[PDB]
Amino acid sequence: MTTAERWQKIQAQAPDVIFDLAKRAAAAKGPKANLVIGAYRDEQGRPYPLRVVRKAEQLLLDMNLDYEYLPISGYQPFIDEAVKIIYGELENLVAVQTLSGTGAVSLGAKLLTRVFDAETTPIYLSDPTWPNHYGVVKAAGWKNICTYAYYDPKTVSLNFEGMKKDILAAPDGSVFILHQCAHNPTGVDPSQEQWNEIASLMLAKHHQVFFDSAYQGYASGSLDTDAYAARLFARRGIEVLLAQSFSKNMGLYSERAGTLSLLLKDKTKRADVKSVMDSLIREEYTCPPAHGARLAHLILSNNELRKEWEAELSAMAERIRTMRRTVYDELLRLQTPGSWEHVINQIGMFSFLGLSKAQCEYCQNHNIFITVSGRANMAGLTHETALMLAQTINDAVR
Amino acid sequence: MTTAERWQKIQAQAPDVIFDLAKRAAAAKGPKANLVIGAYRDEQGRPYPLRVVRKAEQLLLDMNLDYEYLPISGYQPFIDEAVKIIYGNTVELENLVAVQTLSGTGAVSLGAKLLTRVFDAETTPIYLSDPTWPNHYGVVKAAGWKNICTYAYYDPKTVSLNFEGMKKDILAAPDGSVFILHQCAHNPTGVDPSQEQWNEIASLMLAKHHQVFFDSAYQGYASGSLDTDAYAARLFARRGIEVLLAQSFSKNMGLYSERAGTLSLLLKDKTKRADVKSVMDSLIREEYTCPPAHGARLAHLILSNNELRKEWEAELSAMAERIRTMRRTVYDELLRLQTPGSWEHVINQIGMFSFLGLSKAQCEYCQNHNIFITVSGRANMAGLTHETALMLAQTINDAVRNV
Predict the structure, then answer these.
(1) Cβ within 8 Å of residue A357, ≥6 positions away
(2) Residue B113's closest chain A neighbor by CA?
(3) For the Aminotransferase class I/classII large domain, which residue ranges apply (chain B) (predicted)?
(4) Which of A37, A267, A324, B56 has the fewest CB atoms within 10 Å, i.e. the most exposed one?
């Protein structure tokens, strides 16, 4: 058998649904709205490097830094500042830099196979969730992937009774992947009181909590407010594993800046956990890229840049709210059948519109690129495309 | 059982031996030579951001670029230019499938995973050189390879390739095994096959229908010429081998911290390239979604811009030459001190390292005297200065005589 014959037999894999549709949207001719990937655009619909990031790039260049290898764990000042934005002592936690949020979810999922039997232990995702959760957790070796009830499309709200039921029905010592805020795709989060109840269930059932924190800042417009869940779980004594991204809230999508952190009381065990994290990193990519981490560190740590960043993120969230309102008002003007309050009540970057698969296909075929599940990036809208979206929905629904 | 009690059961792993000794070396006080990690240092022993890279940082900043996600496969202009330096502007460039990776380590890991979709990784041997980069073993294991093997390669008695043993092991392997080959600048020994040995190795890989996986982390350092250093990969391509290749820009461009690499396959069947790419992307997406852009953008600018490109090649050639001057300095001093034994390997070995031949106890000695080579006798010759070359030749001379 020749190598060519072996390669002949390789099994193709389907394209990533989201990235492929973004490609289609980017390639489309004529008036259009590319509303696929949750990336922020400005008032004119332009890609938007943050002003604080522009400043940071110059400040970094002026430092005449070298390009020597980071430690396997990454750039420590970045790790330290990043963990502080989520939790508000660093001796209680063990953390490394990761290839953004995705890399954190992967490394965490892998790490967890050292403490749970991933051949049989259920790992739970929300219904619905970020599609890549399935693929990441499966690649990390999880054979038993389950769901918890979360969203109820008929009422555009949480099916909280169902979620609780599923948490309690799970065998003791299961892993639950929770969105820390700005649930993707639904834009509906537990209330603070619901979070309290969820923490008590996780404790009572001895479940492992794994937070995915990709949009801190975008639920409320405030980083502090949006960290409510992770901080509550910490106060409760939960051994929180958390995957953090700076892609969306700092707009460093291309630079892949994230962390993975675990809360754990015992100092010796924290060292042991760090040694496993490092072995997993070393055997995949040796050490992480510095540029994203260095940009983020300088913004988080410089007093002026840090204040400027928070105000910029707040303004970005406000612009999303104006877009929701522009879409909603137009749906009302056109008298589009159904209720549309979820457009203005959902938070984060998206609306999860509730259209049928055929209706979403219709939108896409009329150059309004929302997903087949009905998710629309509100942060990708301008005034003009906000009206186009509403008008296309109106046609799709009738 | 509480989650606190379950975490209690996690088992500690040993620290990375090379990154750990590098940390000790950097921490040590007094007259020292930190020769652990294979990272280039200048005439004064300082980290050396390349002049062309500094120029490229300004040109990128002036372009006022956004930070939107790259495609899963990465930045196509980088990828295209990067594979060109390995194969040249040739027919092979239309016959290949390539993605951006997290540097060379990322490419070795990704390639090792991809190969588990073409070969049975529970059974099929995957071969490493005796000895090799310490991280090869862990990378390949972690990708799912259960039968990791070695081929005879370095002979400490002759400071040379045991080429007869190498051929024997290539032939003794079952047909359709995987071989990881260092494209040039062998790590850790600095001993490469001659061009004539490479031609014989290609014939054996074709006869046995083995998969070749080149690890190409130092293109430029074996000779100071990118063209000369690409001989092995270019010969294998020309002779019809489906080369899988892991490329790094950490060393030849100094982009250690930015993690810029590629993984590429030459494929007989131009029509299965899409299928292979779909697998590569699936593996990437489930790990980190898409790669970091800054290193790829820097490297792309340097590769594609005519003036930067010419300037980079000059600069790399000058780096390679400084390494040679350090080897010659060590060697002339070993001759002068009439150190017992032969030392021509010092000047004949190429790339960043010397495998010096000292015993374990002799290397430990050197380490305790602040000459930080590895316990296997590996020395980063590119970390030397005139001054520390003499100190290395002297501490070697003390270690041979007294330990």
Answers:
(1) A372, A373
(2) A284
(3) 32-396
(4) A267
